[PDB]
């Protein structure tokens, strides 16, 4: 049947080849008459879980649960979890749209809402990961240094030992990462097993209370300790929000699995479930460990065997005394340790202490490895789009699975430098702010997509309410402020600067962002609003349709039309295409884009309006009948003077004059512009009341900065002995309209016979098109029907001598008075259709406008365009 | 010449008679073939000066100067003058645009920025003036009560005497106001003369030092007092902002002259200059009096001759002794005189004593008279505007000059009630905030008019910078908050409530406000923005041109098309008008308004688009070639099934089919809707790949609240023995597009001969259109060019039997399967142009769709409309 059935091969044209077996027929033919890929578990779940988990489970979780209450600590965890889950829901929604080629969160953000935000967030996120690797390596070095300092071993000052260990660790991590994407997965699995072993060791040792640890804070699940550990016992210059700020970074790292989207077996399924499961499991483990530590250890303790453990005569109505006096009465002296003074509680409540030490080692190393892997991927994805041209390179992949070795080396260098600094406690909040900004950008991506009701939003993952996403972005910003407000300001400024730079760069890319859909929707909504507004005389605007063909053919005329339309009124540059329909469609499709881009590149607020018809008359008919939307429709027809009418087929001149006639018939106002295309005052000779357009146009000219210094001087026609009366009337009328005029000149020389020379010149010019009916018999009635109506009938030439003499005399007056004007505006002669031939009308116009400064012959609708009523 | 020269009579038609000869010729006729008025001084200057001056020049200015030094008091006056001068500049700008028919600031505000704000501000301002009448009368009563209590002539308490005196004065003022406008002006002049006499008396007395007043603070213009008082004191619980709030109401009252616009000889010349002169003179007098009082009286004093006045040896480091010791050394014991404890200081520092009291009487009475005059004016103007229908009563005018007698009575009643309350100290801030809100609305009117760039702005008064006006409105809001913050919140709430009520009432009025111009400018700017956005498959929208004629003939089809276009994509209702051009233009002009209003009233976000042409074919050509603006152009022709084609001239059917053909030639998509107009699943039978529109339309259908429950079930064609493979392929394709489907059905019964009965029925239906070439001879070729291309040839009928049987069998299948669907979407058969006659195409469509639920035959553009990439 030649009509192809729906087939995936038809739509598959970017990630594969359709081939000969799949090719949808075009409408014309029917019409025209004749590599490593990971699963969701090992690719998203494990990476997300390992990135989320860190030293908080073994260092600060006990301190947080002590400073705050069990209930308040659980609340802090839950609120951080809200912020991360909302972010994860938004990420899954943005990832279940189409095929994600690679990159990571940068790819999702860019393909969602445009290269500007995409590049800003991509650079920020890549830098954040490149510095996070160094921070995690520094944490590992700190843990190793503390472990060796607890013994006698040491090489150099603590800082230098930290630097050495960090450098060795970073070198090893870079080697492992360069080894490949499978070795890294094996190492991640090993580290996860070790960390789970450490967690289980802590939980097992919390169930075995050894008396030797009694002088410590550990007691072994005593309900009295639990009841005493509620409430916010803040023993410092800190508060609830300080604890929240300290803990929240422990909820981050939820985008690790989506950072390697270019290596997943199948995104759109692995990312959502993997990320959500990782968030759930990590939050559950955090809550469990918080409660466990809060039900075993007392806040304060003075570890000492000599400490009274016999519970002699006393009351000391605290939780500790409820079972024994061990680690009691340090409310005045700074007792050694406890749930609020020792950060190794997890290492003591546990069993095998080196098991917990290895758990911390794995927690830091897994995060470092994940960051080192993820940052180069984002950088290479952002570089492959050439958003920052200098960053070209750092995008070449090596081996079967394209791996950014150059990005790997760059991340290694950045991490090594930041480790060489070795003092990173002041930079962590900036990195946290960067991550929070990325989360907020993802949430805003989802919200923007839901706001712009693009039919192609079509996300495969539900449970992504737009309002929840907006609330999540707001919460991300608020949490960003809650910790290191000045860091938040710095990140905001950096993001805004990058966004502005990218917007000004205007990169050559087009992805289908929600920004374009929202632009269309905004235009549609505003047009629909405007369609319900009644038109008023004082709200009239010149809405011009300029017949120019190619808008670049005559630039002076286009600029002039722009002057009195730019920012006030509509401007449609109409172009008529002629020839066969087939090639005409392709030519119009090319020209539309070419000329719209040309206009936008020259600051012309005009609309290109191509049209295909047999002749210019029919195309202009199309435009004057249909061009426009609702109330934004042309009311004025603008033409340029047919400067070549003298040497041109009379059919073209007839078409020009017929354009005039159809413009008048359709109740349009006609503006004919005659100026020298090759490349003071404004004189307005408006002698017939067209409704005011002749005055409105030059006033709008004066409203612009190009004609601000030009003063309007008016010319009118009067009767001798009555000059002053008419001048006063014109001055009063102009004052009522509030149009400033430098001078008013009343001329009685109109209606007088022009000179003999000018009449002779007009006759000589008009001779070739004269019919000369008198010199011929009735046979001439065939020329008037075949070689006509171009021919000028002697009857009309004698019946309209007044108008011809008026045109010649008016040209004389214009030359004598307005020769020094910057622009002339004059009433456009109107010829009744059927009474005057096209050739005679063209000759009238040519005689009127010949050899003068830029001139505009204006004939308005005759509907009132000005008013003096408020 | 029948062309009329410019003349004021053509444009003078709304506020004056046009006349016989005052009628410009219409473009068709030339182209078609064939009592008491006041001047600016007595009307604006005097009223503004008398309203601005209150009891602050004799009661509170001295206390203010005492509380804050000379410099700080001068600063307060200057800042209040900034707020008022900005307001006055905006008022002059808004009043020098057109002829101000009547009313006051209400008329200017309404004619500037729309009936909503106009009515809100008018009601609030009228109420403010009415209440101010009572407040000024209460001030007069208080002054008289104090004067008579100084001599113990009070009767029936004090408040109960204030009530009686105020009632008598209000009755007298009402009588004077009813007496006419000239008598009020004479009384105003008399009061002004008295007040100037009082001011001059104070200034003269300040130069006549008298030892009698030595016990009082007055000393005689001594420098030492000036240096002492040049600095702030701010005694008691007083602050700079508190004194500024106390003083600022003194600067108000600048709109008294503009409130009399309906009785001025020449507004646009009297209001601006008069108001500015009033502001200047009042501020100058205020500054002079403040400085003079600060240079002649000490802040503290104790008036007694027995007190120490010798100035003998005494340390008294304070500067009060610089000239004498009279009225000194009460820094601990409260004093009874001075610039901080006595308010009658002016009366004491003057010459004749009762003349100051007379000046106070005049100041308090002139403001009351002005308010009682102005409030009815504004109320009558806003009532003649008929913005609140219940208030149409208070619009009648009496006498030669329309005088709102009912408004006068209502204002008198309101003032009498508020005087009967007699305790207005708590209501003054409300009135001040109302006045400030009016000032802010005037400034925002000027700013909004400058924002929208309508050519009709054209204000005759310069010096009105838009940013200055916006700053003035902001300052007015801030000042109104500064004093009585809760009063400011209450006034804001009242203004917003009135604005919402007026917006929802939708009054039937059109004045060409700045809001409409801004709507147009916003739409144009958004369209210009959208014109620069590149096109992407992800952002494709269905932009439909529905050929419906009158948009109310078939409501069901319009609803159906609007369901999948509202909020997503454009919708243009195209109507073609035939007949003579002259009458056609008027018909289209009326129809455009009628149908746009009908659409907006019916909640259709569509655009009515009428064209004039001699046949539907070329009108649709106009629409498909030119309709739209920039990137908001249609790409899908929507047609209703010709249900009468069986009984209708075959020229109409040929035009319909050629509409199809031209739609395809212009590479448009085509949607044909067949549904019953007189009186839950969506079945998509898309069998040919059109690019995806057949699938994209029903999805958008399911995207709306009216089709949320319906589930999409798909039907495709397949080969027997491989049904499951094709079903899996279709399921995968739909999942990649993210279009939810309840079921997929693969049909092998296509391309099979339908029932004999159905073929016989099709033949019977098609019988009276066959060319019967075999039965006839070569002469039949004439019918192919005279009765054709309607006639169905025998060659085509025999050569396209497969397609006809396909249509019949497809209708059988749809009746068998989709008979219970809420809507059906099917692939529209495409007939090669020149190969199939129009009648056979129509019969194909009829056979395909009949005895079915609502159906959409969709033939997409064959360009990809869906994508599974991101
Ligand atoms: C890079 C960076 C910057 C700022 C804060 C964090 N913290 C995070 C982040 C994600 N998951 C857990 C944590 S954590 O709870 O602090 N555990 C942890 O081992 N942090 C190490 C840096 C010592 C990480
Ligand atoms: C109706 C009203 C409400 C609130 C404040 C004012 N004050 C104004 C207004 C205009 N010019 C001067 C003043 S004034 O300086 O306060 N003098 C004065 O006599 N006010 C009298 C009410 C006693 C007026
Ligand atoms: Cl992350
Ligand atoms: Cl006022
Ligand atoms: Na980790
Ligand atoms: Na007054």
Residue numbers in the entry:
A (entry chain A), B (entry chain B): 217 to 250, 282 to 926, 1022 to 1212
From the paper:
Na+–K+–Cl− cotransporters functions as an anion importers, regulating trans-epithelial chloride secretion, cell volume, and renal salt reabsorption. Loop diuretics, including furosemide, bumetanide, and torsemide, antagonize both NKCC1 and NKCC2, and are first-line medicines for the treatment of edema and hypertension. Here we determined three cryo-EM structures of phosphorylated NKCC1 individually bound with furosemide, torsemide, and bumetanide, unlocking two modes of interaction of loop diuretics with NKCC1. In all the three co-structures, NKCC1 assembled as a C2-symmetric dimer in which two TMDs are separated by ~30 Å within the lipid bilayer and two cytosolic C-terminal domains (CTDs) interdigitate and associate extensively with the TMDs from beneath.
